[PDB]
Amino acid sequence: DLSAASHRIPLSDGNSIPIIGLGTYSEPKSTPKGACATSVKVAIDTGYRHIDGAYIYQNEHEVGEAIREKIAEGKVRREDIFYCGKLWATNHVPEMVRPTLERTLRVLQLDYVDLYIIHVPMAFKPGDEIYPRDENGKWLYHKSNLCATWEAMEACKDAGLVKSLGVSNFNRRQLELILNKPGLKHKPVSNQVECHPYFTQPKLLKFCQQHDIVITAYSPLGTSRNPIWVNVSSPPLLKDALLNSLGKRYNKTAAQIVLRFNIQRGVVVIPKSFNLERIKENFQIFDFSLTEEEMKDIEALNKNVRFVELLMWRDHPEYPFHDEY
Ligand SMILES: NC(=O)c1ccc[n+]([C@@H]2O[C@H](COP(=O)([O-])OP(=O)(O)OC[C@H]3O[C@@H](n4cnc5c(N)ncnc54)[C@H](OP(=O)(O)O)[C@@H]3O)[C@@H](O)[C@H]2O)c1
Ligand SMILES: C[C@]12CCC(=O)C[C@H]1CC[C@@H]1[C@@H]2CC[C@]2(C)[C@@H](O)CC[C@@H]12
Numbered sequence: 001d002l003s004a005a006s007h008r009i010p011l012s013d014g015n016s017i018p019i020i021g022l023g024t025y026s027e028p029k030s031t032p033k034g035a036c037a038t039s040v041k042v043a044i045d046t047g048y049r050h051i052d053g054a055y056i057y058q059n060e061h062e063v064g065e066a067i068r069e070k071i072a073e074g075k076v077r078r079e080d081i082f083y084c085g086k087l088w089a090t091n092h093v094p095e096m097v098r099p100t101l102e103r104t105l106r107v108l109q110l111d112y113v114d115l116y117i118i119h120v121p122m123a124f125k126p127g128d129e130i131y132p133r134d135e136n137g138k139w140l141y142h143k144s145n146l147c148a149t150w151e152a153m154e155a156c157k158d159a160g161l162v163k164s165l166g167v168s169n170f171n172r173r174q175l176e177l178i179l180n181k182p183g184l185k186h187k188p189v190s191n192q193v194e195c196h197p198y199f200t201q202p203k204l205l206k207f208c209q210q211h212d213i214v215i216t217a218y219s220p221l222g223t224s225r226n227p228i229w230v231n232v233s234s235p236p237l238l239k240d241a242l243l244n245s246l247g248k249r250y251n252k253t254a255a256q257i258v259l260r261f262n263i264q265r266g267v268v269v270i271p272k273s274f275n276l277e278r279i280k281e282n283f284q285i286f287d288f289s290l291t292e293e294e295m296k297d298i299e300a301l302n303k304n305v306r307f308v309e310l311l312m313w314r315d316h317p318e319y320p321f322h323d324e325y
């Protein structure tokens with residue numbers, strides 16, 4: 001059972017993961033310096049013990065600053081904090097995996113990360129640009145070799161630089177490539193994908209559960225709805241009539257309802273907020289439960305439409321979203 005003080009759930013490698021974490025992606029341009037550090041500190045003060053981040057979010061040094069400050073003052077021990085980092089598309093070449101993880105460790109100034117995941121199954125041209133596009137606009141797709149990339153990840157765990165290994169934005173067959181790998185040492189313990197009531201991931205969740213893989217729900221609140229990259233065709237998730245009606249019943253916000261929905265069914269949620277009140281609000285989800293009837297009803301909101309389509313990359317051979325799941 002889950003509580004504010006104790007809400008870690010088992011991973012297949014004997015480790016465990018806090019079922020709620022703080023997401024840390026924020027638009028580099030429109031975000032004040034220090035905002036991420038401040039939020040991570042508030043989150044830890046609030047009770048979060050899981051932070052989701054990525055070097056390419058450009059604020060990993062702020063995440064590290066915050067975690068180390070809280071450890072230094074004795075708010076938490078290192079082992080009490082769960083940090084997930086991500087290997088980006090430009091860094092899939094096996095020889096680059098360990099140096100890329102080591103960079104993140106040096107940025108955080110920590111000895112290990114709790115979880116390290118392949119960010120997308122698509123490889124891009126290695127280089128100083130995380131989004132490689134030629135003069136004419138065309139994205140530069142390096143050939144993907146997921147099993148080889150995974151082998152390089154496994155070696156990182158063998159070296160003790162990371163406790164658990166996972167993936168993100170992987171479809172069922174991409175998960176199969178790895179699960180069926182000849183001589184596999186460490187299976188993925190987690191797949192981080194878009195998940196929330198408008199895109200509930202019914203099949204992928206069942207598939208993962210059968211293979212003892214935990215789903216981490218990114219954009220669990222339906223995203224910030226930034227037009228530049230979000231599919232704003234769907235109505236804003238938080239304005240949903242049913243989610244709002246249930247909020248009233250429990251004296252909770254729509255956001256609190258949607259978070260409770262996913263964690264109640266064993267899905268890890270990583271809502272992002274850099275706002276003091278909302279950081280606290282998102283954590284207050286252990287003092288009520290939804291009925292099965294309500295869960296069913298929230299499930300039924302599924303639109304099978306993604307806020308996060310990444311269409312500009314739909315031409316890459318490993319684009320994950322062509323398949324049904
Ligand atoms: N693996 C991947 O490919 C991938 C992709 C996307 C995201 N992620 C991860 O998942 C994290 C969360 O997903 P996300 O950032 O895209 O979107 P999200 O967590 O679903 O929602 C973020 C938006 O909701 C607002 N918000 C937060 N709490 C709220 C509340 N209680 N009421 C109303 N609004 C609220 C935030 O604004 P404020 O900050 O002002 O509160 C922000 O604009 C990301 O930060 C990142 O760590 C991973
Ligand atoms: C979706 C997403 C995917 C990759 C990531 O980690 C961040 C996220 C939000 C920012 C997006 C990016 C894909 C590429 C862009 C759409 C860039 O072209 C401008 C903003 C970028």
Ligand SMILES: [Cl-]
Nearest residue numbers: 055086087088
């Ligand atoms: Cl990276």
